[PDB]
Amino acid sequence: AQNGKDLLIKLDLQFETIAGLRATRISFNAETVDVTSLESQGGWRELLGGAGVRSASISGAGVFKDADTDERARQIFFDGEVPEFQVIIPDFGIVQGPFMITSIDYAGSHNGEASYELAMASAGALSFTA
Amino acid sequence: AQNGKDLLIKLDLQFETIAGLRATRISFNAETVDVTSLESQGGWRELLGGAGVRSASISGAGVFKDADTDERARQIFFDGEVPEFQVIIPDFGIVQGPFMITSIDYAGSHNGEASYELAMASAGALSFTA
Amino acid sequence: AQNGKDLLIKLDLQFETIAGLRATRISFNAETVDVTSLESQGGWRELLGGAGVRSASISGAGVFKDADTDERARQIFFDGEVPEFQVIIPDFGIVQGPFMITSIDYAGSHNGEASYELAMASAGALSFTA
Amino acid sequence: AQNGKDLLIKLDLQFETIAGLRATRISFNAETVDVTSLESQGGWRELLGGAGVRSASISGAGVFKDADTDERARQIFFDGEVPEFQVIIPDFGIVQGPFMITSIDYAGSHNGEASYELAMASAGALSFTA
Amino acid sequence: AQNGKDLLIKLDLQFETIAGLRATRISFNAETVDVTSLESQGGWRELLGGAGVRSASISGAGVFKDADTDERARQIFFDGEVPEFQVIIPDFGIVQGPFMITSIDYAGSHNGEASYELAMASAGALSFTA
Amino acid sequence: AQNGKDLLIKLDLQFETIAGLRATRISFNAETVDVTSLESQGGWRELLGGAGVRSASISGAGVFKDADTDERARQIFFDGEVPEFQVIIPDFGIVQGPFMITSIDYAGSHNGEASYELAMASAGALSFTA
Amino acid sequence: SYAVAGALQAAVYQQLRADAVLAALVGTAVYDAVPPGPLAGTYVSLGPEDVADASDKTGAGAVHDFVISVITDAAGFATAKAAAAAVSDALVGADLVLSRGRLVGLWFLRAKARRVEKADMRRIDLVFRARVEG
Amino acid sequence: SYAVAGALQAAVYQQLRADAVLAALVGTAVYDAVPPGPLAGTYVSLGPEDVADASDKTGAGAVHDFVISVITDAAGFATAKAAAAAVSDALVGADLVLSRGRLVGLWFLRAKARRVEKADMRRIDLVFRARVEG
Amino acid sequence: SYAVAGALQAAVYQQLRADAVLAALVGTAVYDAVPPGPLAGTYVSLGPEDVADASDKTGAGAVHDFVISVITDAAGFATAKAAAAAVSDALVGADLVLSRGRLVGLWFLRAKARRVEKADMRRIDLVFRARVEG
Amino acid sequence: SYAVAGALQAAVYQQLRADAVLAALVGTAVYDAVPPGPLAGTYVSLGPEDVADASDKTGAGAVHDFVISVITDAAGFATAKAAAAAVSDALVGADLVLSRGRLVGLWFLRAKARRVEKADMRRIDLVFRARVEG
Amino acid sequence: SYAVAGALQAAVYQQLRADAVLAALVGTAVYDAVPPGPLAGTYVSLGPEDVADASDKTGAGAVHDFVISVITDAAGFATAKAAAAAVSDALVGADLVLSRGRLVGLWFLRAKARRVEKADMRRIDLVFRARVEG
Amino acid sequence: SYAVAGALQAAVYQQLRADAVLAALVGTAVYDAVPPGPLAGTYVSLGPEDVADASDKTGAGAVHDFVISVITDAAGFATAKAAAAAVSDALVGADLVLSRGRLVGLWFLRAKARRVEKADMRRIDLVFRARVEG
């Protein structure tokens, strides 16, 4: 098993952690292009596999703490870019793909913290450092 | 980290806080225009990034307290306008964009307060004071 | 702030309160007609604002108590009409618009009260008494 | 206010209560045919009102107790009919409309009762006894 | 009222209970073919009734206990069949219709039982033994 | 009944358990191709049965523990494959079908474990060892 | 408690001591205040309600969950059941008359039954929901 | 408690001892601090509130759930009901005047009623919700 | 408690003391009221139910969650298990006959087992759900 | 408790005994440790916090829900309200300076008020939420 | 409790006192009933289960959440940990043989550890979930 | 408790009494078993964990929510804060070495702080979550 604190998503300015990251989640996806034909051994669904596109999405939330890199996430959204992002699995290693900044949202209440979700999605080819 | 009380949305009449704002939330959005091509290094989803439109939405709720600016939110909705609104992040600074008044709703019960949600969305180009 | 008991929706017969109104809620709406163009300063979403239609909807629930005006809400639904309705904000004042009686529903259990929701929506031009 | 036990839905065989009716709910509906035009005083949504169709739906649930009229609800569903049904509001009076038997479902667990929902909808013109 | 243990769904091999049936539910359905015309007494929705198709669906869940008939539900799904199934209401009697095996799912956790849902739907004409 | 620990999903490298599998669930599916005709004995829905395609889907979640086979699930997703997977029911036996790796997602919090869901779906013809 | 509670305990005391059963099964020993004397020992008691404030904009009401306990000095408490059965036969769906407002439904709720003290006396509470309208 | 709580107990004490009913039903025995003497025995008591902090960015308020108990030495506590009924008739929808801020709604909440001690004295709490605005 | 509770404890007492097992494992020591004497010490006890009021518009019923405790003076309480096992073998899915109404299912619920006092006596409660129909 | 708790109680003690109100209403009787002597009797006390561990990957913080009680020997406790009102006027939205880290918001929470003992002394707790950042 | 509970405590007692560890760490001091004598003082105890009634239409089973406490007279209770570690090493995923039915999984649940009395004796409960099938 | 609990309390005792702070602030008075003598009076204590059984099909682990209390005889308990601050500075994100398995994260949880007895002694519990992997 691994520590929850060790897996961290991070922006460029050279990569630094975004200050408040109470909850984070890398999520991979595929759309399963169906290739079903008349002749099937049991009638089981037939899928091509590799041809279908594939995705990654990052959702990192927590307390809004101002840092130099938290202001960077403001800069990525207003001036529309697709910079490099990096989520490191504790054992697996870093990811290092170009993502974008699809939806961010700052929220605060009359008695709570200033908090934010930061939702991202893949914008290019990924990697894996092993 | 920042105080929840410091980040405040505000109407024009010169900007003042709307009286009861128990919960407020600026929320930015993008639709991620997909530009996938045959030739991809791993078949990873390809996104153009900057070309796609981008949004902002404000949802501020709390107790209905009558002020001069709470009556303004009545005036913006009945006489359809797109005036200037301003949500200030505690460290980041103000936003100062033209929003509209997409849905408001006053609610009250037999034992609770008179309360309201005030949901807004971007109607023009935004800003950032830094 | 205002009392929850003071904001009241009411039918015509001259307007009287419908007997049981444990929970009530006026809710305004707009559909935000999008007018996005090629040339935008930051690519921010552009909205016309005033041209788009606008709505109001009333949802008042509580205990079924028979009154002369509760029988009126039966009469409005069976003989299809669009009479005048009036929800008064405690400070703001009355609304006085023609609404209709889109869905009502009486409900009762083996141990509870006879209860009802009364859901309404705008059918004409509204007002505001200030 | 009225007793929850007094408002009762009932089948024909001459009308009798279906044995277990822990929870019951008459629900009326309308679809609000929109008649919006260019010229509107405030741009408020314009609705014709009376022309649009109108509905009623009954959802009565509780313990499965076998009676002569509970077997009737089996008979109405298998041999497809639209017989007369009658939900009586405690003060308002009976309804006496032809409904149908759109979905029924018997359910039982390893430790609970045999229970059922009985969902109905209007199939013809209704009434009101006052 | 009836015992929850008495109403039981059962497979063929001659019908036997599937071993673990903590929760079971027969559910009947109809789609209410609408026949609305210009001339209506109150504008009430008009429904033909009998012409519309009608359904039955069985959802039986509980602990995965291996029996000779639990292995039969594996056999019905892989080799696609529509065999006879039978859910007996405690007073009403058996149903005895051909159903199919639309979705089954075995589930187990690190500390719980091996459990399953077994969802079925009607595939032919039903019956009722009275 | 069977132990929850005994039913296990497993990858190839020769099959080994993926390290953390707190919750797992094989789920079979069919789409019920409807063959309804004019002449029906009671108007009951008629289904062909066997002709319709059929599916299987695996959803195994738990703590992210790095093993040689947990790194394999990274390798299956980036280099798009449809390898052989195997979920063993405790009494029934193994399944041994080619599945794919439709969506995986690693998640970690500021105080919890590193966790993951691993969602799979059938990509070819299945089996059953009995 | 709420304004109806002055009249509610008065009327449920009057529907008691008028049922023919529980008059041949308890006697005249239905009270709130105990008549001092020899303590007959198979009485009931009707005092502890509580309110769940179900009210309105226009008007107000109350949900009185009043407790009627059954106390019995007998060795077993099968004697206390039929006295409590005659309570519940007398009160669910009562439709009685109040002095302040009216009630709309006198339903039934939880009814625990245990030994209070030294296992000599047996208390059967009977909670009844009284949705009254002021 | 919150800043309004200095003025809230003062004003709900002043609306009490001014109602005509409960002045002919309790008398002058409405207090927080007990006047020592003979202990008349059919008093009420108005002290224990608690706050549920309903506040704002701009301004702040409070939800005072104050308890007004009714204590009665009478044998039955039908006497204590009408005194508590005259409490609740005096306070729900009060719309009174405070010295720090104002209240917006004085609603009603749970009101239990039981025997406190030796079953000689009867306590009827009456929780009232006081949403005040500072 | 509810009207059926007079007949329910009577019938579950009659299905007990008729099972052949627990008659060779307890004896005649199944009771509610304890027969005074020497206190044999491996008895059971069937008194404390409570009701969960499952009722109807037309008719009413009850969910009696009655407790049957097993008390045993033996040094270990493996003796008390098989006596409680013979309770549960006698009562789940009973389908017995009542004097007021009938029951529809006598299921099984939680059954805790502990040392009551000085760790000399061992109490095994056995809660059974009795959905009766009046 | 958490690392900031050494400096938090120190700074909220320093914002107290500097407010002009509660210095003319309590005096110098604001403390944690009681100065032994005659026990003046209208003091406050600031000790019992608890932490709700709101932290981060990078850095960590705390939610100190510290309790400031107000104790008063006066006959009524309208005296104890204005002293507690001067507590709450001094602390909500404080924006003070800490020695380890800083706080970001000193909000307000529940504030119960009751009689502790023999009904002679009156305790008004005041829970304040202190989200500090280490 | 349920019918399997006569055989379950018997079989988990037999898997204990057969493990080689906890036989060199406790000895023969694994019991339910205490053998009277000198009270050795580093024993364990296996009695208090409770049932969570997981059953079926066809057949019935039980979820026995039995508690095995570890008591130790040593000054620290690092001695009591390894004895409790040898409990948990002996029982999770046991797959043992019962006399009435069988169990399907002997999992692990909460295991608190505290000082019972005068802080001289240390109790480490160990709740194990035993899903048995009758 | 679980198998790792023999080694977990041993290793968190060894990371304590090695920090330079809390060695000049408590001294050698960090223990589970109290060394008898004069009772120095500003000690800490590390014994009561409990487990939340986070395990696997293949392997098993534990969530030890162990409590480290801080006891202090000083008049105020600002002395007890910095000793507890030096506890929390020593343990959150510890990454230490165990003898049975390893831990993956030593987080922080609730940490209450109160007066235990006669208001002379002050207990600051500090609950730390220890997700260990066997």
CSV table of N, CA and C in Angstrom, one decimal, chain F residues 54-129:
chain,number,residue,atom,x,y,z
F,54,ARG,N,-24.6,-10.7,-25.8
F,54,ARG,CA,-24.5,-10.8,-24.3
F,54,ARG,C,-23.1,-10.4,-23.9
F,55,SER,N,-23.1,-9.9,-22.6
F,55,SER,CA,-22.0,-9.2,-22.1
F,55,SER,C,-21.5,-9.7,-20.8
F,56,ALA,N,-20.3,-9.2,-20.4
F,56,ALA,CA,-19.8,-9.4,-19.0
F,56,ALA,C,-19.0,-8.2,-18.7
F,57,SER,N,-19.0,-7.8,-17.4
F,57,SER,CA,-18.3,-6.6,-16.9
F,57,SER,C,-17.8,-6.8,-15.5
F,58,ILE,N,-16.5,-6.4,-15.3
F,58,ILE,CA,-15.9,-6.6,-14.0
F,58,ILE,C,-15.5,-5.3,-13.4
F,59,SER,N,-15.8,-5.1,-12.1
F,59,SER,CA,-15.5,-3.9,-11.4
F,59,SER,C,-14.8,-4.2,-10.1
F,60,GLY,N,-13.5,-4.1,-10.0
F,60,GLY,CA,-12.8,-4.5,-8.8
F,60,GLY,C,-12.0,-3.3,-8.2
F,61,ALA,N,-12.4,-3.0,-7.0
F,61,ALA,CA,-11.8,-1.8,-6.3
F,61,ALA,C,-11.0,-2.2,-5.0
F,62,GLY,N,-10.2,-1.3,-4.6
F,62,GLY,CA,-9.5,-1.5,-3.3
F,62,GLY,C,-8.3,-0.6,-3.2
F,63,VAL,N,-7.4,-1.0,-2.3
F,63,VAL,CA,-6.2,-0.3,-1.9
F,63,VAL,C,-5.2,-0.5,-3.0
F,64,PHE,N,-4.6,0.6,-3.5
F,64,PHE,CA,-3.4,0.5,-4.4
F,64,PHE,C,-2.2,0.0,-3.7
F,65,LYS,N,-1.9,-1.3,-3.9
F,65,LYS,CA,-0.7,-1.9,-3.5
F,65,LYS,C,0.1,-2.3,-4.7
F,66,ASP,N,1.3,-1.8,-4.8
F,66,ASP,CA,2.2,-2.1,-6.0
F,66,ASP,C,2.6,-3.6,-5.9
F,67,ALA,N,2.3,-4.3,-7.0
F,67,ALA,CA,2.7,-5.6,-7.3
F,67,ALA,C,3.2,-5.7,-8.7
F,68,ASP,N,3.7,-6.8,-9.1
F,68,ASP,CA,4.1,-7.0,-10.5
F,68,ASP,C,2.9,-7.0,-11.4
F,69,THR,N,1.8,-7.5,-11.0
F,69,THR,CA,0.6,-7.5,-11.7
F,69,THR,C,-0.3,-6.3,-11.7
F,70,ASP,N,0.0,-5.4,-10.7
F,70,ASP,CA,-0.7,-4.1,-10.6
F,70,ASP,C,0.0,-3.2,-11.7
F,71,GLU,N,1.3,-3.3,-11.9
F,71,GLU,CA,2.0,-2.6,-13.0
F,71,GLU,C,1.5,-3.2,-14.3
F,72,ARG,N,1.0,-4.4,-14.4
F,72,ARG,CA,0.5,-5.0,-15.6
F,72,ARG,C,-0.7,-4.2,-16.1
F,73,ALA,N,-1.6,-3.8,-15.1
F,73,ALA,CA,-2.8,-3.1,-15.5
F,73,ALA,C,-2.5,-1.7,-16.0
F,74,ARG,N,-1.4,-1.1,-15.6
F,74,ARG,CA,-0.9,0.1,-16.3
F,74,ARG,C,-0.5,-0.3,-17.7
F,75,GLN,N,0.2,-1.4,-17.9
F,75,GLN,CA,0.7,-1.8,-19.2
F,75,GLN,C,-0.4,-2.1,-20.2
F,76,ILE,N,-1.5,-2.7,-19.7
F,76,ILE,CA,-2.6,-3.1,-20.6
F,76,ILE,C,-3.3,-1.8,-21.1
F,77,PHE,N,-3.3,-0.8,-20.2
F,77,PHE,CA,-4.1,0.4,-20.6
F,77,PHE,C,-3.4,1.3,-21.6
F,78,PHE,N,-2.1,1.5,-21.4
F,78,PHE,CA,-1.3,2.5,-22.2
F,78,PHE,C,-1.1,1.9,-23.6
F,79,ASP,N,-0.5,0.7,-23.6
F,79,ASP,CA,-0.4,-0.1,-24.9
F,79,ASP,C,-1.7,-0.9,-25.0
F,80,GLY,N,-2.7,-0.4,-25.8
F,80,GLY,CA,-4.0,-1.0,-25.9
F,80,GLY,C,-4.1,-2.4,-26.3
F,81,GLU,N,-4.5,-3.3,-25.4
F,81,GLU,CA,-4.6,-4.7,-25.6
F,81,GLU,C,-6.0,-5.2,-25.2
F,82,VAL,N,-6.2,-6.5,-25.5
F,82,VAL,CA,-7.4,-7.2,-25.0
F,82,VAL,C,-6.9,-8.5,-24.4
F,83,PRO,N,-6.2,-8.6,-23.3
F,83,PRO,CA,-5.7,-9.8,-22.8
F,83,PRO,C,-6.7,-10.6,-22.0
F,84,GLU,N,-6.3,-11.8,-21.6
F,84,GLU,CA,-7.2,-12.7,-20.9
F,84,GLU,C,-7.3,-12.4,-19.4
F,85,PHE,N,-8.5,-12.3,-18.9
F,85,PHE,CA,-8.8,-12.1,-17.5
F,85,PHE,C,-9.6,-13.3,-17.0
F,86,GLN,N,-9.7,-13.4,-15.7
F,86,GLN,CA,-10.3,-14.6,-15.0
F,86,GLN,C,-10.9,-14.2,-13.7
F,87,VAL,N,-12.2,-14.3,-13.6
F,87,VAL,CA,-12.8,-14.0,-12.2
F,87,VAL,C,-13.4,-15.4,-11.8
F,88,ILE,N,-13.0,-15.9,-10.6
F,88,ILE,CA,-13.4,-17.2,-10.2
F,88,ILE,C,-14.5,-17.2,-9.2
F,89,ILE,N,-15.7,-17.7,-9.5
F,89,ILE,CA,-16.8,-17.8,-8.5
F,89,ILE,C,-16.4,-18.8,-7.5
F,90,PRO,N,-16.6,-18.7,-6.2
F,90,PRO,CA,-16.1,-19.7,-5.2
F,90,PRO,C,-16.5,-21.2,-5.5
F,91,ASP,N,-17.8,-21.4,-5.8
F,91,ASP,CA,-18.3,-22.8,-6.2
F,91,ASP,C,-18.2,-22.9,-7.7
F,92,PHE,N,-18.8,-22.0,-8.4
F,92,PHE,CA,-19.0,-22.1,-9.9
F,92,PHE,C,-17.6,-22.5,-10.5
F,93,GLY,N,-16.6,-21.7,-10.2
F,93,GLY,CA,-15.3,-21.9,-10.9
F,93,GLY,C,-14.9,-20.7,-11.7
F,94,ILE,N,-13.8,-20.8,-12.5
F,94,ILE,CA,-13.2,-19.6,-13.1
F,94,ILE,C,-14.1,-19.3,-14.4
F,95,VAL,N,-13.8,-18.1,-14.9
F,95,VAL,CA,-14.5,-17.6,-16.1
F,95,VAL,C,-13.6,-17.6,-17.4
F,96,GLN,N,-12.4,-17.0,-17.3
F,96,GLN,CA,-11.4,-17.1,-18.3
F,96,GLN,C,-11.9,-16.5,-19.7
F,97,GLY,N,-12.1,-15.2,-19.7
F,97,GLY,CA,-12.5,-14.5,-20.9
F,97,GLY,C,-11.5,-13.4,-21.2
F,98,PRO,N,-11.4,-13.0,-22.5
F,98,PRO,CA,-10.7,-11.8,-22.8
F,98,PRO,C,-11.5,-10.6,-22.5
F,99,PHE,N,-11.1,-9.7,-21.6
F,99,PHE,CA,-11.7,-8.5,-21.2
F,99,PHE,C,-10.8,-7.4,-21.6
F,100,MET,N,-11.2,-6.1,-21.5
F,100,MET,CA,-10.3,-5.0,-21.6
F,100,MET,C,-10.4,-4.1,-20.4
F,101,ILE,N,-9.7,-3.0,-20.4
F,101,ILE,CA,-9.3,-2.3,-19.2
F,101,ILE,C,-10.0,-0.9,-19.2
F,102,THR,N,-11.3,-0.9,-19.7
F,102,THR,CA,-12.1,0.3,-20.1
F,102,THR,C,-11.9,1.5,-19.3
F,103,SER,N,-11.8,1.5,-18.0
F,103,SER,CA,-11.5,2.6,-17.2
F,103,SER,C,-10.9,2.2,-15.9
F,104,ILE,N,-9.7,2.7,-15.6
F,104,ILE,CA,-9.1,2.6,-14.3
F,104,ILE,C,-8.9,4.0,-13.8
F,105,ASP,N,-8.8,4.1,-12.4
F,105,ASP,CA,-8.6,5.4,-11.8
F,105,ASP,C,-8.0,5.3,-10.4
F,106,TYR,N,-6.8,5.9,-10.2
F,106,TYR,CA,-6.2,5.9,-8.9
F,106,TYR,C,-6.6,7.2,-8.2
F,107,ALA,N,-6.8,7.0,-6.9
F,107,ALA,CA,-7.3,8.1,-6.1
F,107,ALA,C,-6.7,8.0,-4.7
F,108,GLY,N,-6.4,9.2,-4.1
F,108,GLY,CA,-5.8,9.3,-2.8
F,108,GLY,C,-6.2,10.6,-2.2
F,109,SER,N,-6.3,10.6,-0.9
F,109,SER,CA,-6.6,11.8,-0.1
F,109,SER,C,-5.5,12.2,0.8
F,110,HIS,N,-5.7,13.2,1.6
F,110,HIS,CA,-4.7,13.8,2.5
F,110,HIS,C,-4.5,12.9,3.7
F,111,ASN,N,-5.5,12.1,4.0
F,111,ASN,CA,-5.4,11.2,5.2
F,111,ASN,C,-5.7,9.7,4.9
F,112,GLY,N,-6.3,9.4,3.7
F,112,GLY,CA,-6.6,8.0,3.4
F,112,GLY,C,-5.5,7.3,2.7
F,113,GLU,N,-5.9,6.1,2.3
F,113,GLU,CA,-5.0,5.2,1.5
F,113,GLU,C,-4.9,5.8,0.1
F,114,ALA,N,-4.0,5.3,-0.7
F,114,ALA,CA,-4.1,5.3,-2.2
F,114,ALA,C,-5.0,4.2,-2.6
F,115,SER,N,-6.1,4.5,-3.3
F,115,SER,CA,-7.1,3.5,-3.7
F,115,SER,C,-7.3,3.6,-5.2
F,116,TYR,N,-8.0,2.6,-5.7
F,116,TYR,CA,-8.3,2.5,-7.1
F,116,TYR,C,-9.6,1.7,-7.3
F,117,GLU,N,-10.4,2.1,-8.3
F,117,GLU,CA,-11.3,1.3,-9.0
F,117,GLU,C,-10.6,0.8,-10.2
F,118,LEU,N,-11.1,-0.4,-10.7
F,118,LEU,CA,-10.6,-1.0,-11.9
F,118,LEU,C,-11.8,-1.6,-12.6
F,119,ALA,N,-12.3,-0.9,-13.6
F,119,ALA,CA,-13.5,-1.3,-14.3
F,119,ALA,C,-13.2,-2.0,-15.6
F,120,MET,N,-13.8,-3.1,-15.9
F,120,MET,CA,-13.5,-3.9,-17.1
F,120,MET,C,-14.8,-4.3,-17.7
F,121,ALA,N,-14.7,-4.7,-19.0
F,121,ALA,CA,-15.8,-5.2,-19.8
F,121,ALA,C,-15.3,-6.3,-20.8
F,122,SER,N,-16.2,-7.1,-21.2
F,122,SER,CA,-15.9,-8.2,-22.0
F,122,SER,C,-15.5,-7.8,-23.4
F,123,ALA,N,-14.4,-8.4,-24.0
F,123,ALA,CA,-14.0,-8.1,-25.3
F,123,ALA,C,-14.0,-9.3,-26.2
F,124,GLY,N,-14.4,-10.5,-25.7
F,124,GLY,CA,-14.4,-11.7,-26.6
F,124,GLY,C,-15.3,-12.7,-25.9
F,125,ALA,N,-15.1,-14.0,-26.4
F,125,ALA,CA,-15.9,-15.1,-26.0
F,125,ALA,C,-15.4,-15.6,-24.6
F,126,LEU,N,-16.3,-15.9,-23.7
F,126,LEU,CA,-16.0,-16.3,-22.4
F,126,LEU,C,-15.9,-17.8,-22.3
F,127,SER,N,-15.9,-18.3,-21.0
F,127,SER,CA,-15.8,-19.7,-20.8
F,127,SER,C,-16.3,-20.0,-19.4
F,128,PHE,N,-16.2,-21.3,-19.0
F,128,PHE,CA,-16.7,-21.7,-17.6
F,128,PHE,C,-16.1,-23.0,-17.3
F,129,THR,N,-15.3,-23.2,-16.2
F,129,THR,CA,-14.6,-24.4,-16.1
F,129,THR,C,-15.4,-25.5,-15.4
